[PDB]
Amino acid sequence: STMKFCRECNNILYPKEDREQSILLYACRNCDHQEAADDNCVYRNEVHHSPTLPRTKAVRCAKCQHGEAVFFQATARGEEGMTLFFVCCNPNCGHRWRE
Amino acid sequence: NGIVTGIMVEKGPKEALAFFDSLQPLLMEHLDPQGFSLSLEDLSMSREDMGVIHNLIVREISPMVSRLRLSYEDELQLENSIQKVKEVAANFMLKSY
Ligand SMILES: [Zn+2]
Ligand SMILES: [Zn+2]
């Protein structure tokens, strides 16, 4: 939602709809001035939000010789239902393998 | 500590105190013509062993603190790796009299 302003008073515009033509139009509240709208959105929020996954430490990896591979529940495109996969938290791993 | 307990079992407490009062000056006089002291060479670890232990801060501790960037609660794993380093560190400085 970008703010819009009046061309006579340069105050903030107030959206206001009369159902004579089924049309939205921005109106000013200062003098009397009105004009026709262009956009659609009356309000926009983008509310907010603009590891705690379980780890093991006793399994072989592919690249690094570590025990860790974090496992979370997934349902992949070639998988089925509940599946587990193992990629090490080391960035040397980079590889996702099935059991 | 086994022998003093056996003496206290067999002949009472007033023989255990006689054991202590006969043993302690017998020890403190045995230390008198030998002495015992420290040195600067005791606190000086050798240089190639210093190079060994410095090659473990950036081998299994810097790649572990690379995981500490996001992982929080592995502090006991942290201390496990740390004491794994500390034990082999303390292993060298017991090779002195
Ligand atoms: Zn106006
Ligand atoms: Zn790997």
From TrEMBL, chain A:
Q: Which domain of life is it from?
A: Eukaryota
Amino-acid positions noted as binding Zn(2+) 1 in the UniProt annotation, renumbered to this chain: C6, C9, C28, C31
Recorded GO cellular component terms are: nucleolus; RNA polymerase II, core complex; RNA polymerase V complex
Some GO term, biological process aspect, for this entry: which one?
transcription-coupled nucleotide-excision repair
Annotated positions binding Zn(2+) 3: G67
> Quick one: where is this thing mainly located?
nucleus
Query: Where in or outside the cell is it found?
Result: Nucleus, Nucleolus
Keyword Zinc-finger tagged: yes
Q: Which UniProt keywords apply?
A: DNA-directed RNA polymerase, Metal-binding, Nucleus, Transcription, Zinc, Zinc-finger
Q: Where does Zn(2+) 2 bind?
A: C61, K63, C64, C88, C93
TFIIS-type domain location is 57-98
- Where does the chain cross the membrane? none
**Any Pfam family the entry gives:** Zn_ribbon_RPB9
The reply to whether Magnesium figures as a keyword in the UniProt entry is no
Q: Where are the zinc fingers (C4-type)?
A: 6-31
Q: Which GO terms describe its molecular function?
A: DNA-directed RNA polymerase activity; nucleic acid binding; zinc ion binding
Which InterPro entries does UniProt cross-reference here? Answer: DNA-dir_RNA_pol-M_15_CS, Rpa12/Rpb9/Rpc10/TFS, Zn_ribbon_RPB9, Zn_ribbon_RPB9_C, Znf_TFIIS
Q: Which family does it belong to?
A: Belongs to the archaeal rpoM/eukaryotic RPA12/RPB9/RPC11 RNA polymerase family.
Q: Which purpose does this protein serve, as stated in its record?
A: DNA-dependent RNA polymerase catalyzes the transcription of DNA into RNA using the four ribonucleoside triphosphates as substrates. Component of RNA polymerase II which synthesizes mRNA precursors and many functional non-coding RNAs. Pol II is the central component of the basal RNA polymerase II transcription machinery. It is composed of mobile elements that move relative to each other.
* Subunit (UniProt): Component of the RNA polymerase II, IV and V complexes. Interacts with NRPD1.
Which PANTHER family does its entry note?
Answer: DNA-DIRECTED RNA POLYMERASE (PTHR11239), DNA-DIRECTED RNA POLYMERASE II SUBUNIT RPB9 (PTHR11239:SF1)
Protein name, as recorded? DNA-directed RNA polymerase subunit
Give the source species. Brassica oleracea
